């Protein structure tokens, strides 16, 4: 990649910016520029490419074969009980969380058994997060 | 990629911006520019490409074969009980969450058993999040 | 990559920026520039590439074969009980979290059994986080 | 890579920036520049590449074979009980966390049984974090 970037607040080529109780006074702001940006990306002069697969079987005898590809989950539990047995009793609760198997961002590519692959591949995930907030 | 970017508030080529109790006064803001941006991306001079697959079988004998591709889930549980047995009793609750298997963003590409692939592939996920907020 | 960068607040080519109780006064700000940026990335002069696979079987005898690819999960538990047996009793709670198997960001690429691969591959994850906040 | 960098607050080519109770007064700020940046990255003059695999089997006899690829999890537990048996009793709680198997950022590439690979591969993870905050 080129230029992959995370600005928390503010960004610029230039900024004469100001704020609050500012007496920006009697000013000469000049700005001659000559910004000239060129890009030549993933450029391919190829005269012969091939992606050949060949699967020859003859007089063979094949039993109890299992190709499992990735991320086989199996026989999973999440047992999560709660009880509140009150008697002559005050309860207050607040911001009271029972998170179980939360996801947010789940990106996959070329999750395979096989691949003949040829080229650019990419993954990008700029962000802000906050799971919980209270007062 | 080129130029993949996350601005929290504000962004610009230029910004003479101002705020609040600002006496921006008696000013000369000039700005000569010559911004010249060129892009030449994923450009392909190819004289011969091939993606060949061939599957020859003869006098073979094949039993109990299982190709499972990825993400086989199997036999999963999420048991999540709650009880509130009150007697002569005040309960207050607030912001009281029982999240179970929440997702947000789920992007997939080339989730296969096989692939002969040729070219650019890409994935991008700019964001803000907040699961919970209270007061 | 080129240029992969995380700015907490603010960023620029230039910044004459100011703030609060600022008497920026009687000023001459000039700025001659000649910013000239060139990029020539992932550029490929190839005269012959091949990705050849060949799978010859004859008079063979094959039993109880299992190709598992990665991330096979199996037979997993998460037992998480809670009890609150109150009598003549005040309870206060706040910001009271029972997180179990939370994720945020989950990016995969070429998670395979096999791959003949040819080219650029990339992964990028700029961010801010905060799991919990309270007062 | 080139240029991979983490700025906590603010960044620039130049910054005449100012703050608070500033009397920036009677000033001449000039700035002649000639910033000229060139990049020539992952550039490949190749006249013959090959990625050849060949799998010849004859009159062989194969039993009880198991290729497991990486990250095989198996038979895992997380038993996490809590009890609160109050009688004639005040409880206060705050910011009271029972984190179990939280992740944040999980990036994988070429997690395989095999790979014939040819090229650039990359991974980058600029960030701020804070698990917990309270007062």
UniProtKB/Swiss-Prot annotation, chains A, B, C, D:
Expressed in the brain, including in the frontal cortex (at protein level). Expressed in lung epithelial cells. This is Transmembrane protein 106B. It comes from the Eukaryota. Residues 1-135 are lumenal. Changing residue 91 to A: Decreased number of infected cells by SARS-CoV-2. No effect on infection with HCoV-229E. The chain holds residues 120 to 254 of 274 of the full protein. Disulfide bonds join 95-134. In neurons, involved in the transport of late endosomes/lysosomes. May be involved in dendrite morphogenesis and maintenance by regulating lysosomal trafficking. May act as a molecular brake for retrograde transport of late endosomes/lysosomes, possibly via its interaction with MAP6. In motoneurons, may mediate the axonal transport of lysosomes and axonal sorting at the initial segment. (Microbial infection) Plays a role in human coronavirus SARS-CoV-2 infection, but not in common cold coronaviruses HCoV-229E and HCoV-OC43 infections. Involved in ACE2-independent SARS-CoV-2 cell entry. Required for post-endocytic stage of virus entry, facilitates spike-mediated membrane fusion. Virus attachment and endocytosis can also be mediated by other cell surface receptors. It is found in: Late endosome membrane; Lysosome membrane; Cell membrane. Glycans are attached at residues 26, 32, 45, 64. Can form homomers. Interacts (via N-terminus) with MAP6 (via C-terminus). Interacts (via C-terminus) with the vacuolar-type ATPase subunit ATP6AP1. Interacts (via N-terminus) with AP2M1 and CLTC. Interacts with TMEM106C. (Microbial infection) Interacts with SARS coronavirus-2/SARS-CoV-2 spike protein (via RBD domain). It is linked to Frontotemporal dementia 2: A form of dementia characterized by pathologic finding of frontotemporal lobar degeneration, presenile dementia with behavioral changes, deterioration of cognitive capacities and loss of memory. Gestural apraxia, parkinsonism, visual loss, and visual hallucinations are present in 25 to 40% of patients. Frontotemporal dementia and/or amyotrophic lateral sclerosis 1: An autosomal dominant neurodegenerative disorder characterized by adult onset of frontotemporal dementia and/or amyotrophic lateral sclerosis in an affected individual. There is high intrafamilial variation. Frontotemporal dementia is characterized by frontal and temporal lobe atrophy associated with neuronal loss, gliosis, and dementia. Patients exhibit progressive changes in social, behavioral, and/or language function. Belongs to the TMEM106 family. Signal peptide: none annotated.
């Amino acid at each position: 990649s080129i230029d992959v970037k995370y600005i928390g607040v503010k960004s610029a080529y230039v900024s004469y910016d100001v704020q609050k109780r500012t007496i920006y006074l009697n000013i000469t702001n000049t700005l001659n520029i000559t910004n000239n940006n060129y890009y030549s990306v993933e450029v391919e002069n190829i005269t012969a490419q091939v992606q050949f697969s060949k699967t020859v079987i003859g007089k063979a005898r094949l039993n109890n074969i299992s190709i499992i590809g990735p991320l086989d989950m199996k026989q999973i539990d999440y047992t999560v009980p709660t009880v509140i047995a009150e008697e002559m009793s005050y309860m207050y609760d607040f911001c009271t969380l029972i998170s179980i198997k939360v996801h947010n961002i789940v990106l996959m590519m070329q999750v395979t058994v096989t691949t003949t692959y040829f080229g650019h591949s990419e993954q990008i995930s700029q962000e802000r997060y906050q799971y919980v907030d209270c007062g």
